[PDB]
Subunit: 311 residues, 5 copies
Amino acid sequence: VSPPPPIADEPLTVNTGIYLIECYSLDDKAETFKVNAFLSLSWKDRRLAFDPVRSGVRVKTYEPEAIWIPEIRFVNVENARDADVVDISVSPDGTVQYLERFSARVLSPLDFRRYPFDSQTLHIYLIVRSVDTRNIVLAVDLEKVGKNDDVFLTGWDIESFTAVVKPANFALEDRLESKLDYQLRISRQYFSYIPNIILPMLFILFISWTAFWSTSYEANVTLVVSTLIAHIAFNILVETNLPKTPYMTYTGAIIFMIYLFYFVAVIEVTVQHYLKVESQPARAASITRASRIAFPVVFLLANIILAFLFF
Amino acid sequence: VSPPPPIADEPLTVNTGIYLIECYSLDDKAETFKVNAFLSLSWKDRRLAFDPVRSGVRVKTYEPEAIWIPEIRFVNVENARDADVVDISVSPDGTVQYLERFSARVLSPLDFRRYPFDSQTLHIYLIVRSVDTRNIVLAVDLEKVGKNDDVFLTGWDIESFTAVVKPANFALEDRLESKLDYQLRISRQYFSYIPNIILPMLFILFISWTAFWSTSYEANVTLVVSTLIAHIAFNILVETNLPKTPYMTYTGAIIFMIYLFYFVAVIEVTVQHYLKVESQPARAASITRASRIAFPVVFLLANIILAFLFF
Amino acid sequence: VSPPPPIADEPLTVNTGIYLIECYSLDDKAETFKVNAFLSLSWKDRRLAFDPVRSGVRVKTYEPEAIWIPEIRFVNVENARDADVVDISVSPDGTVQYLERFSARVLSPLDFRRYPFDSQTLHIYLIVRSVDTRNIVLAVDLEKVGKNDDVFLTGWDIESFTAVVKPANFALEDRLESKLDYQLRISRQYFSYIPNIILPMLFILFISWTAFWSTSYEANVTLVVSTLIAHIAFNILVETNLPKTPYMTYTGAIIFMIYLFYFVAVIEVTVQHYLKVESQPARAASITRASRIAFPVVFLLANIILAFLFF
Amino acid sequence: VSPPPPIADEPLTVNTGIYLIECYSLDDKAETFKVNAFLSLSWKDRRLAFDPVRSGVRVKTYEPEAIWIPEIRFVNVENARDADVVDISVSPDGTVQYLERFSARVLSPLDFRRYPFDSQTLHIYLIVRSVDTRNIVLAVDLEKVGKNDDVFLTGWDIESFTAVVKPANFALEDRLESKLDYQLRISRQYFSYIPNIILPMLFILFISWTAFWSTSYEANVTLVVSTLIAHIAFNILVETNLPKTPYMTYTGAIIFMIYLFYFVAVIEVTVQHYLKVESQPARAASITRASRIAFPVVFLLANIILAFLFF
Amino acid sequence: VSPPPPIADEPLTVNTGIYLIECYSLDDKAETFKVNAFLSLSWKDRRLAFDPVRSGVRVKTYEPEAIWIPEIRFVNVENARDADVVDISVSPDGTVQYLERFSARVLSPLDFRRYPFDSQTLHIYLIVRSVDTRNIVLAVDLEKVGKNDDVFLTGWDIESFTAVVKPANFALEDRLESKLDYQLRISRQYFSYIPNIILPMLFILFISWTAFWSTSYEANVTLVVSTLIAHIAFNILVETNLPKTPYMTYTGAIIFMIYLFYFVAVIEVTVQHYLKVESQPARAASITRASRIAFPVVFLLANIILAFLFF
Ligand SMILES: CCCCCCCCCCCC
Ligand SMILES: CCCCCCCCCCCC
Ligand SMILES: CCCCCCCCCCCC
Ligand SMILES: CCCCCCCCCCCC
Ligand SMILES: CCCCCCCCCCCC
Ligand SMILES: CCCCCCCCCCCC
Ligand SMILES: O=C(O)CCCC(=O)O
Ligand SMILES: O=C(O)CCCC(=O)O
Ligand SMILES: O=C(O)CCCC(=O)O
Ligand SMILES: O=C(O)CCCC(=O)O
Ligand SMILES: O=C(O)CCCC(=O)O
Ligand SMILES: [Cl-]
Ligand SMILES: [Cl-]
Ligand SMILES: [Cl-]
Ligand SMILES: [Cl-]
Ligand SMILES: [Cl-]
Ligand SMILES: [Cl-]
Ligand SMILES: [Cl-]
Ligand SMILES: [Cl-]
Ligand SMILES: [Cl-]
Ligand SMILES: [Cl-]
Ligand SMILES: [Cl-]
Ligand code: NA
Ligand code: NA
Ligand code: NA
Ligand code: NA
């Protein structure tokens, strides 16, 4: 089998379309997602053209092996897609209508900077390598691009699934390549992070600040050091559900900053006890009284500063 | 091979049936389950019809490749089902009786709102895309729908396995699609959650309340802070066996509310010590005496309120 | 290819045999085990019969595709078995001797009630569906049923591998099915549970009881609360190695009961301190003195009661 | 295709050879390792013999399907090996030289008794089942047995890869089986266990013994209980990287014995406090003074005893 | 199919090229990485020569099965590569231009010594075994060696992807083997290690040193002991995170050294209390005063020494 011949010197336009059936397994650590969709391809092959009157039949159905099909591949997939051909239909003029159902694990980078208040643009890149006889260019048939109403991505809100209609045409290893960008716009469902990580984390911090209404060094040491260990447990829990980034994430910045608050609380608790032992509780009382205001005020201001920088 | 031709303008009715052999791996986090079943298909192909008298044989057995078989697919599967054809039998009138054994990982969403006292409706959606020549419509042969008596789903009680007999007929990419809903009704075995999470969690909370019968600030700080850490441990344990939901679960609500009880106990412990140091233990005693009643009463009432909202 | 014709109206007897080569991956959580074995099948096909004198050869070797082979399947397998045909031999009378080497992940339920002092009966169910022309019945050739001497199942003792010689003959979807039960009897190697879970757990419990020889409320609170947290660590460790059961397991009962001992010790520690503060240490001393005997005595008796109910 | 006929009544000698390319994934819990190697087979088939003068070529290359190849299998593999035929070469006398590249997950039991100062002998068992016409016996061609210089097994030192040249010839299901033992001798790289488990574990034990230079019961309770909890963390850590053995391992014995030291330290701490409260600190002092010497002396002696029994 | 015949006694030169499409899953524990690339092969087969005037085509396209293709394999891959042939083009002179898209899990050793400030040279080894008729030698076509601009390896910086143009020609099992070394130079993104492991770890070490400004033994015991439990909870981590090395990594040496600081602080805390109880706080004060300077000074110097030895 050979590719369709050009009437003039024009390339072959393969009209593409992806219709999402299932969206699942968005792995943040792996920066991958799994997809189950329909891939529709359409091109003109005049060699397959027929007179509908003389043939009786308006449409002709073919097996993949029987006709020439353009080698369309996905750029950002882990292993080559599992594909099952649904139908191949030839119209009288020779227009082929290919339809397959596929499943693929797509590699798409995520921006964790605003986590867990981040939004992502997942990509599915379609590509075709031009052949020796003629060049192949990709196109988007918007009527065959979409997603099923039941398509849900656990822990995410699906906003849109659109295609950048203009292909990226470039040269690779002395041959022309036509690439298409299918974009799935999603936003993270931050809800669960509030009662499970954010609020538990703040409670333990506020518990550490009760040491500013205590003169008992032994109890203060217990309060500040214990809550610090609960914070490490949370810090570890958070970094296990995320990949290692060469930048700070929003949660990462807050979590890190809270260590400084624990450290400074230890200094305060230490200073207050030292002064008390030195028989100067007057200075120790003023420092502790200031801390009561200073710690929540600086925490509240530092968080306004961080939220401003990240959002 | 081509589809059977219509006698009049009628579509082709493919009578379906799923008989469950094994049910396993209900993954809560993934919202998937694995199934091993029989898929039975039946349709009329008059081209395969034969006179039983002249043929001698009352039934004719065929290989899948030898005859036209409708392309029936599962909508909500991770990867395309692994299928092994058991038998294909043609009756004298041309009625084909197809039987295959399959295994599939089914994607079915879960309602975690009443966890671990939740019940679910798992779905298996069958679909067929109509061809060029004629439309294909799905049907349910109730005689061939069921499940084996030994079918067990670890940690779940299987109530029913029925089919919504009326197919969902719709249009997708200029063709007709006939969808069927097979529903597996299951209820969670909550038993283990009581001696492993619920009762241990309440014990540690009641241990924290013994600080209301203690004047020792250093001991109270130990009691309330230490038990709080065991609660953080149980909170993490519970959320590791669950996905992130944009809603509050029953266990989630209880676990969250218990943080407030720990926080308020820390305030009490702090208040009692402050007053005692300020040489006013009469106020400290009245607050501690009230707490002894207030904490269990408000906990018992708050739980009645929550159970009412959730059930 | 068609099945062998009956001389009279008799069904076809397929003599089976499973010879275990390797046993591995007994997953308690999953209630599965992996096997690697030989499957031997034998049936009479008179169409394949030959005169040994004129043929010279006493035996004739065939390729699977060349002759009719009964569709034998495993009921309780995750995915269809990986099978490699070793040999197919036809005797002069037409007796076929089939041999294949297979590997399968078998789903077999486990009874955790007596864990880790439990014994299991793993099952491998063989099945054959009767065909259009004639019925197929399964049989056991005890001479071809066994296991290799080196067959080891990590953390288990293999007692026996036998077959229930009488098949379960029943009707499913208007056809006869002949099922066979191959039983692998195994007992759990409890040894490791004693120095890793059982003894460490008792040590921490006995450490908590040293609070009955202490008047230091602050120290007692530390003793009882710290050891309680280690018990939570062990409970979690144990429940991670097991599936969630709708019944109490032996270890589960002991672990749960120990929480009650920790709770009552907290009550004692609280009571002793309250009385001491109320200036009545005479009552506090008598309660603490009684606890010294009561706690080990009630623990020893409660365990005798539990061991009696479980074994 | 049939096996080569015997000139006299002799069996067929298949000369084997395994040349390791890559060694990886030695899983201690699973008692498995992954291998990537060359399998070379050589036998005489006089039916394939040719005159080198008349033929023109001194060697003839064949496709697997074209000639008879002995069904050589691995005994101790999880799933049947992934094999890719590299070459099949026939010499003028009819000597066939088969070469394939394979990858397999090998099940080989491990002796954990001396962990992490243990050495293992990994096995790869080759087997051949004799056919109807003639018997097949395995042999070792030492010239084709080896391993690549770059072959590394992460966390292990590879000592040797040799073959037990004499095959284990036995009868199974009325047919002769010839088995070969390829042995990969390896020793564990214990280094990392010293700064990560052994030394951290000793430091915490020695920290617990500082309670013998303290009269503060409240501090001693903290010292001994805290370090006891950190010992439980190291115990749990160790047991996660190991399978459940029906015997005591070296690390297991030391870890277990250390619990006894923590228990006896709790008794001492308790005894010292009781006597001091009873207004007899003179005994309490003598018991504490003895403990300072007794604990390290008994620990040092007990360890000499254990190392002697284990090595 | 047979290999191309030599015009003179020359070997066959197969010009290779790897163009990386995707880089992912660099597993430090496993010392593996996953790759998705293009493999281009080119050789001369004069038997495939054709006249474009007669064939009516300037370049001929072939199916893999139709022509002789050299058996090129990857040395350091876990399982045989998933390959999909993109194109096979033969020009009139008989020069074949093969192109395939592949995905493989490559085994490449990592040098964790300077971790997490470590740089690595990942290798992809191409190999060809010479055949009976003629020798096959590998070559590098630099024009067809590269990587896509979007190629990202999570947590790593990709520096270069080059090929050692001179093949390693050697003899293995009486045949010539031609090996090629494709080198991917990468450097680890250490950023995340600083706010997640390094700084949290130093904070807890500095918190432990506040015991040098405290006379409260009970509080110092909590301080040094509790922070030690967290320097433990860290190191699991770095350990959870790495393979076991027969050498010391940079982070490993720092973590190990920190344990000595915690141990010596316990000695100090113990010494100070003993002297205080012995009614000699003047010695205790001088030791504690020195410790305040000695501990940070020795820590700062020890770290300069370590950083010097590692870098
Ligand atoms: C003191 C250190 C506590 C560490 C907490 C780790 C919990 C993380 C579990 C994450 C599972 C994915
Ligand atoms: C004193 C704090 C104990 C913390 C125990 C955390 C263990 C984490 C286990 C995570 C396994 C994936
Ligand atoms: C402060 C301690 C928090 C520790 C939480 C540990 C939970 C481990 C869950 C493992 C189950 C897979
Ligand atoms: C109160 C702290 C409980 C921590 C339990 C951790 C158990 C982790 C075991 C991991 C096994 C895979
Ligand atoms: C009381 C604290 C128990 C800590 C348990 C540590 C869990 C180890 C996880 C190992 C990762 C494979
Ligand atoms: C008491 C020390 C427990 C610390 C262990 C934390 C385990 C984290 C596991 C992370 C695994 C990916
Ligand atoms: O035929 C199919 O498998 C796709 C299912 C159609 C849809 O429900 O979106
Ligand atoms: O797999 C089969 O062929 C039938 C299984 C019958 C059953 O549920 O026991
Ligand atoms: O794998 C085989 O073909 C035979 C296994 C023989 C045995 O039990 O060792
Ligand atoms: O993969 C191959 O075909 C040869 C392996 C050669 C080697 O050990 O490097
Ligand atoms: O045709 C291909 O699949 C490779 C994609 C080219 C590239 O974008 O690097
Ligand atoms: Cl395609
Ligand atoms: Cl693809
Ligand atoms: Cl189908
Ligand atoms: Cl499907
Ligand atoms: Cl079969
Ligand atoms: Cl099966
Ligand atoms: Cl073979
Ligand atoms: Cl094998
Ligand atoms: Cl024999
Ligand atoms: Cl190749
Ligand atoms: Cl390869
Ligand atoms: Na084609
Ligand atoms: Na304390
Ligand atoms: Na057959
Ligand atoms: Na070829």
